[PDB]
């Protein structure tokens, strides 16, 4: 996970290039930033299980007729 870098400033803020050795899933397009000390922690936005469990559900016809041949 180790990899060093330099912070460059954007048009509105500071930004950080994530070198390949460290880069996030390209699947991730939104991120939450948490400030802890002089350190910043970024996390993929909305990925705890509790949101999904309490959130939207499938229709009751998405069923267990799994249709694995036999």
């Amino acid at each position: 996970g180790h990899m060093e870098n330099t912070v460059f400033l954007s048009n509105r803020s500071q930004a950080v290039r994530l070198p390949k050795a460290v880069a996030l899933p390209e699947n991730v397009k939104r991120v939450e930033v948490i400030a802890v000390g002089r350190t910043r922690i970024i996390t993929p936005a909305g990925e705890t299980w509790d949101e999904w469990f309490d959130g939207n559900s499938v229709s009751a016809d998405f069923m267990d007729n799994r249709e694995q041949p036999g």
Partner: protein, 132 residues
């Protein structure tokens, strides 16, 4: 590090029923969990054959994007072949997708999580867990 490969059976079980006992194992092992792309094929099929595919697809997408999805690659394929033969020569029956999931996990040393333990217990050199 990844550690667990989720069976298609348990995935269906949780997407449907969202039981708190799996929610707890999910919260504890978040980041240590994956599915075979074989399983991704199955749920996309269930969603595309539902009445409300875009709805169920979206709930499918919500579940999968908290998952690491592994491609069914050459290692997985080869271990599946050995499994299909190891089972055949012992006469033990296991479904085709389940065979490909077992092989995928064995190929990478992952623990399979399933509630169909009886079928997956027939496979050699494979650690099995039931989270339901």
């Amino acid at each position: 590090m990844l550690k667990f490969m989720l069976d298609t059976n348990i995935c269906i079980f949780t997407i449907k029923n969202k039981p708190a006992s799996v929610r707890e194992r999910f919260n504890l092992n978040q980041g240590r969990m994956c599915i075979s792309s074989v399983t991704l094929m199955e749920v996309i099929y269930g969603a595309e054959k539902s009445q409300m595919p875009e709805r169920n697809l979206a709930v499918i997408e919500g579940f999968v994007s908290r998952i690491d999805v592994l491609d069914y690659d050459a290692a997985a394929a080869t271990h599946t072949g050995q499994i299909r033969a190891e089972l055949a020569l012992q006469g033990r029956p296991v479904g085709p997708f389940d065979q490909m999931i077992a092989g995928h996990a064995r190929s990478r040393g992952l623990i399979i999580v399933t509630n169909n333990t009886r079928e997956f217990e027939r496979v050699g050199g494979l650690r099995i867990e039931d989270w339901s």
